[PDB]
Ligand binder design. Structure first.
Ligand code: TV9
Length: 185
């Protein structure tokens, strides 16, 4: 692809993090802690899942960023409305304000309702995410495979400001402790 010139410097917003996450000092890496991380509760925190938002809000333009997923067995990535539900159980869908892909149990899916099987021959170690606000597009690219297209959500109805969205996943297996990292420009 040719989206690299729309690169934006994303940072994680600690206040939105599930209370078990550890965000690095530079706000560019997030991972699940061993226990709870000794923060007060607030209405912004995701309660049920190991999720966090980027600090940046987008309401126009074209934006691009990259995320490192090396070693991980499970994660969700994409964008979401600033006003998505934080508490309780919910599915990742455009109806609920999410435009996401994921890895789970050795398969890659897009967060449509119902979910859509992705066809990935080269397991990605870094994912590129492109948003065109005006066009209503969110696209995902396999950086490990020369930028090949993974998935395009088109005809998106954002209906609000967008924030970068992350889920590091649970670590019941002991094989999913590695971080999500925002990769340098
Ligand atoms: C407490 C624990 N935390 C981790 O494993 C962190 C090191 C990644 C845990 C337990 C069960 C499911 N997910 C996570």
């Amino acid at each position: 692809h040719h989206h690299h010139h729309h690169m934006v410097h994303i940072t994680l917003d600690r206040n939105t993090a599930n209370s078990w996450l550890i965000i690095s000092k530079d706000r560019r890496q997030v991972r699940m802690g061993d226990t709870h991380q000794n923060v007060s509760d607030n209405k912004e925190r995701f309660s049920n899942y190991p999720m966090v938002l980027g600090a940046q809000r987008f309401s126009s333009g074209k934006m691009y960023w990259e995320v490192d997923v090396t070693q991980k067995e499970a994660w969700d990535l994409g964008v979401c409305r600033d006003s998505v539900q934080r508490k309780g159980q919910f599915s990742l869908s455009p109806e609920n304000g999410f435009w996401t892909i994921w890895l789970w149990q050795d398969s890659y899916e897009a967060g449509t309702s119902p979910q859509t099987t992705l066809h990935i021959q080269v397991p990605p170690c870094q994912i590129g995410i492109f948003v065109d606000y005006e066009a209503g597009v969110v696209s995902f690219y396999n950086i490990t495979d020369h930028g090949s297209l993974i998935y395009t959500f088109s005809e998106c109805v954002f209906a609000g400001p967008l924030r970068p969205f992350f889920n590091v996943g649970f670590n019941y297996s002991g094989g999913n402790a590695a971080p999500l990292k925002l990769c340098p420009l």
